[PDB]
Symmetry: C3
């Protein structure tokens, strides 16, 4: 009964201006409304409903598909049983739900229920505030969480996960790479199959592991398993408490040990192995090699204080003195 309006089908209603109802009990009551299908409803302003029992009751709403429902202001729902119920909500796919304000859900059973949430992919879930999930079966449930990849999961507050099966579960955790795990508080990992599980741990490289609290493991298969350990280099190990290893295959296993160079090994407490292949097994020493593989130390200035090193020139002056004491005797 509205202006420039048609109502075809039994008990259909076109009361809105510029409205077009069609189908048994199709109700196009909003202004500029179009309702198609049995029991379809376009009651909002500028609303369009297509499909049996479809509902476009929000202002500026569009619902397409059987039982599709666009009840939010500025809502759009496509697919059987889709629901766009938040303000500024958009749903595309069967049984998709965009129920948060400013939410967008795309894929069968995709769910964007947080404020400002976005879920893309079948059975993706963006349930945290300001959460973003992109990938089938992905989950961004933490506040500010972002998950990208199939089965990626960002569950910590401020967590970010990128990669198939990646998991960022600690507060302020970040994981990148397939199967990467950032589970410590304030943990960061990047590399497929890498793990940063200590609090304050950071790992970089495929299969790198920073399990110590405050540990840092950088390089493929690097291991920083001690508290406060640092390991840089593929296959490096810093397993002592407060240990430091630098170089491929370096090994700092003593408490406080330091190993610098490819294949350097330091097992002594507070010891240092300096140089490729150097070995420091004695506690509280600096080794510049190993037995049979000693190194000269060069560009040493003359020592002055009692615990400074001595250079050859200082010794040669004593030798010359003894020579002359050989003439005087």
């Amino acid at each position: 009964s509205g202006s420039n309006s048609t109502a075809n089908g039994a008990n259909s209603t076109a009361s809105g201006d510029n409205s077009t109802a069609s189908g048994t009990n199709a109700s196009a009551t909003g202004e500029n409304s179009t309702a198609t299908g049995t029991d379809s409803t376009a009651s909002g302003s500028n609303s369009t409903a297509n499909g049996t029992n479809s509902t476009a009751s929000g202002n500026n709403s569009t619902a397409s598909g059987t039982n599709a429902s666009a009840t939010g202001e500025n809502s759009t729902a496509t697919g059987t049983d889709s629901a766009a119920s938040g303000t500024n909500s958009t749903a595309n796919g069967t049984n998709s739900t965009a129920s948060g304000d400013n939410s967008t859900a795309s894929g069968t059973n995709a769910s964007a229920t947080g404020e400002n949430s976005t879920a893309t992919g079948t059975a993706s879930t963006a349930s945290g505030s300001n959460s973003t999930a992109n990938g089938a079966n992905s989950t961004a449930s933490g506040a500010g969480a972002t998950a990208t990849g199939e089965n990626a999961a960002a569950t910590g507050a401020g967590a970010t996960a990128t990669g198939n099966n990646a998991s960022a579960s600690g507060t302020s955790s970040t994981a990148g790479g397939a199967n990467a795990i950032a589970s410590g508080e304030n943990s960061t990992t990047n590399g497929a199959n890498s793990t940063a599980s200590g609090n304050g741990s950071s790992a970089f490289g495929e299969s790198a592991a920073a399990a110590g609290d405050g540990s840092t493991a950088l390089g493929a298969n690097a291991v920083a398993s001690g508290v406060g350990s640092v390991a840089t280099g593929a296959g490096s190990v810093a397993s002592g408490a407060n240990s430091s290893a630098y170089g491929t295959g370096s090994n700092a296993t003593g408490a406080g040990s330091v190993a610098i160079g490819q294949g350097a090994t330091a097992s002594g407490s507070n010891s240092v192995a300096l140089g490729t292949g150097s070995v420091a097994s004695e506690d509280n020493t600096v080794s510049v090699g190993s037995a049979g593989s000693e190194r000269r130390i060069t560009n040493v200035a003359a020592g002055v204080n009692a615990t400074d090193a001595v250079n050859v020139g200082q010794m040669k002056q004593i030798e010359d003195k003894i020579e002359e004491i050989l003439s005087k005797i």
Copy 2:
């Protein structure tokens, strides 16, 4: 008036072949066109328009919703006031706009205006050429920019940002982690709340900070604030110009200083602190410990040149000589 065509409603037109117009002034003039709603228009080839004042005028266009407009070739627009105007453009959501060629925009007020641009999320913006934004309120405005996460922003040319509130604003900058900032030219940061603000700076770890030009900070809360500084380890600091710190809690504060080991500290100019807990405060020295905590240096080969170090065996030969000069006297 087209073949296999129906036109129900006043002043409706079905001139295209296989065309179906329905509604006051519904115009289904394209081939294989279907126009539903008052003033709806399906004028393109293989075009489908549903909703009051909806327009599908592109070839292979589909417009659904009041005022929805699919004017590009191969364009698809769903939602009230949606607009797919580029070639190969797709828009889903109220007031979404896909105006670039090869552009895709999903979410209320989402905007994909660059060539090859993709925006997913309420009020997301992909305005750069080859730009990608995924997250409510995200922005990829640089050329080749990619932004993922709610309120993520990639504004530099070639910038990439991943995480809630992440920001990549320098040229060729990359930020990963919630609240991460890559603001220097050619800067790279990964870790929640991390910052790479120097030109050529790189930071890895939660709250790591590389503010120096050409600086590198690796580990949770690491600080590389000097020009050309390098800090690796949780809580490491390299604040001197051209300083280097390796180990948890290491501190290289002198110009040109080097601190290697957990808790090593080097404040002297061009000094080196080698070993856990070592201290180098004297300018232009290498310290292997600290006063009271001296270390032996081991596996030292006999010195040859004047500035080589001397080992015990060389001294013992002088001692034996003096012993015999004790017999001869």
Copy 3:
């Protein structure tokens, strides 16, 4: 002929309950079905078809647009020539295809053909199992591959690429940054224009390059080109086999060489340059400076074994002895 059903147009059929067919040969045969357009077909349960030759034959299917086809269970297709044929499949855009089970494809010519695949963007491709592509022209073709950014490509099994033109082509490879390349097996790179091309290589920083097998390059423009090389610092180079460089502009070019400090250079085989500006050119030595720029070594404990270093206090005891041998002579 179904209950609460209307069939307007020649040879249209509304046999389903609550079904509404409209248009020449429009077939609304499913329960709660709505078919609009010439030759449109809504045969599934809870199915809705809009557009000439549109087909909604899946249960809970919705097809919109000319030739649009929703044949999968729980399938939704929007756009001319769109096809949602997998179980739980969703397609939005002209010629989009969601043919995998649990697949979601958005954008003109977007293709989600893998199981659990998700493609967003014009001409995006998610063809691997558990693959995710987000960006125009992006490709996630590996098993578990994830690609984000325009023209991003994740082609390895378990590969993850983020950034415009980023490429992760090795097994378990991860690339982040515009133009980043992770091409080695188990390679990881993060930084625009960075490359990890060795097997087991890892690179961090803009334009960092880890081309050696088992190499690690950390810092802007760092180069770890030797087998097993490690370079940390902007502009650092570790080009020797099994070489290690730490510090901005450090250079470890000898086999087994180690350079620690900004501008330290070690060209000797198995040599070590320790300290800013130190130079180690002699094979199998540890240099603490360079000629003209020698450093004292401090906090050295008295040597005990033959290859331990000697400190000044040990030499002063010999000097005092010689003094007294000067009185006795």
